[PDB]
Design a protein around this ligand. Structure first.
Ligand SMILES: *C(=O)[C@H]([C@@H](C)O)[C@@]1(C)CC(S[C@@H]2CN[C@H](C(=O)N(C)C)C2)=C(C(=O)O)N1
Ligand SMILES: *C(=O)[C@H]([C@@H](C)O)[C@@]1(C)CC(S[C@@H]2CN[C@H](C(=O)N(C)C)C2)=C(C(=O)O)N1
Ligand SMILES: [Ca+2]
Ligand SMILES: [Ca+2]
Ligand SMILES: [Ca+2]
Ligand SMILES: [Cl-]
Ligand SMILES: [Cl-]
Ligand SMILES: [Cl-]
Ligand SMILES: [Cl-]
Lengths: 242, 244
């Protein structure tokens, strides 16, 4: 089931922040969180939507593989790393929104909506623009719903090819050492209140997998490093990582 | 194929450790190879635990291993490497270089299929004489550092004569290091059954814009030098400004 561990609230209070961390122990089929209410509060997915968007693009062939080059559309944008050609690995790594907006236009409203329903992804509502509904549209997902979706991706149980799922999990790679592997996606939702930061993903250990999903209030960008810092504080306190 | 370039300054990283060996690098974008010692780059040695890469591929392609989560039970024999004395899947069997698990793979693959597959791969000298479950440790198979590069390049591009899926799974199992600067997929080795005892590190470094393949081996008279397999490779990578 689900266990509230309110002592984790200290890690947010430490950094004068408010948010939720949700953890799922796959071996034990048990979840933990500092706040059940906020763990089930649905927010815009923002850049964490790159995970389902990648899967759908790959399954439909919009993206042939992780080497396909997606040319810069020639608009100079604020984040310099966006103003260059990308493939799926680097578009994930640098969270290149324009590449993913083009995927969404090519997928189209009908197929996007059908696939999100097949994924059971959040509230499955794509109202808004086809190329920005995960930024300022009707889609909403909670931290606990992020976990449920990621669990299916980990086990290749989403209704897309196994190959699509393997490629997206490769593209999610964030950190690997001799103690753990993290596959994850950050997000920062700014277009609609409340502005929040996301980090969702999982930690692979030798003999278990810990899924995680956190979001936190993010009134300015100065706090963005707290997404990973606070999550790792919780993982460390729980002896999940050294 | 462009002629290989010999960077003798890399020998300083061997001599500063009183060591002898070869590092081979391949810049994929430029299709250009570099080494400190062209002769040794082309000298063939037992692959030892680096054979886990083709062994994994063949076992997956033939269904000996269903996927990277299938559990191979400990046979209960206590061996000297403690991490071997437990159940394993493909990921942890690669990470801890669990020989007994891979010996069972090879026996199940069998002599005929393993010979066919290694010829299809053009793996080293494609000679599997000896015991079916130890020929890469004390039998007839030999591979050079440049031959490791050639094989690894095919794996990177999913060009080996096995399923794309088997190649993707093995590249996942080869994951060693990843940070915001680079990804390393690689396999270490330490050949101890027949002289010369040598250490191996073969794999590649994934950058944003390029891939650098590498294969190194070096004389290993004692286990005290084992850390130089990674350390010498990384300081060559750093010298060439490939990694920070
Ligand atoms: C995704 O959630 C968000 C899109 C919708 O704008 C995105 C791409 C913004 C960045 S935050 C901003 C861009 N680069 C810097 C950064 O990411 N960091 C970590 C300092 C600042 C993110 C994000 O998740 O951080 N995603
Ligand atoms: C493979 O090359 C070798 C087999 C044939 O014995 C093996 C398993 C020995 C080890 S070195 C030694 C045992 N484990 C420690 C280690 O250095 N690593 C990194 C696993 C010390 C290796 C090896 O991969 O280094 N392979
Ligand atoms: Ca549903
Ligand atoms: Ca898997
Ligand atoms: Ca040195
Ligand atoms: Cl996005
Ligand atoms: Cl399920
Ligand atoms: Cl082995
Ligand atoms: Cl990976």
């Amino acid at each position: 089931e689900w266990q509230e561990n309110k002592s984790w609230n200290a890690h947010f209070t430490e950094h004068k922040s408010q948010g939720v961390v949700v953890l799922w122990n796959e071996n034990k089929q048990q979840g933990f969180t500092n706040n059940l209410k906020r763990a089930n509060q649905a927010f815009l997915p923002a850049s964490t939507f790159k995970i389902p968007n990648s899967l759908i693009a790959l399954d439909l062939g919009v993206v042939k593989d992780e080497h396909q080059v997606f040319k810069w559309d020639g608009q100079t944008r604020d984040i310099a790393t966006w103003n260059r050609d990308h493939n799926l690995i680097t578009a994930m790594k640098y969270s290149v929104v324009p590449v993913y907006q083009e995927f969404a236009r090519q997928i189209g409203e009908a197929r996007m909506s059908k696939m999100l329903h097949a994924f059971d992804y959040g509230n499955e509502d794509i109202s808004g623009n086809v190329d920005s509904f995960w930024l300022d549209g009707g889609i909403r997902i909670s931290a606990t719903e992020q976990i449920s979706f990621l669990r299916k991706l980990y086990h290749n149980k989403l209704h897309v090819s196994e190959r699509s799922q393997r490629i997206v999990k490769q593209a999610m790679l964030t950190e690997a050492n001799g103690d753990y592997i993290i596959r994850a996606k950050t997000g920062y939702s700014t277009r609609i209140e409340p502005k929040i930061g996301w980090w969702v993903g999982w930690v692979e250990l030798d003999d278990n997998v810990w899924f995680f999903a956190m979001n936190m209030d993010m009134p300015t960008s100065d706090g963005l490093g707290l997404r990973q810092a606070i999550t790792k504080e919780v993982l460390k306190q729980e002896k999940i990582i050294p």
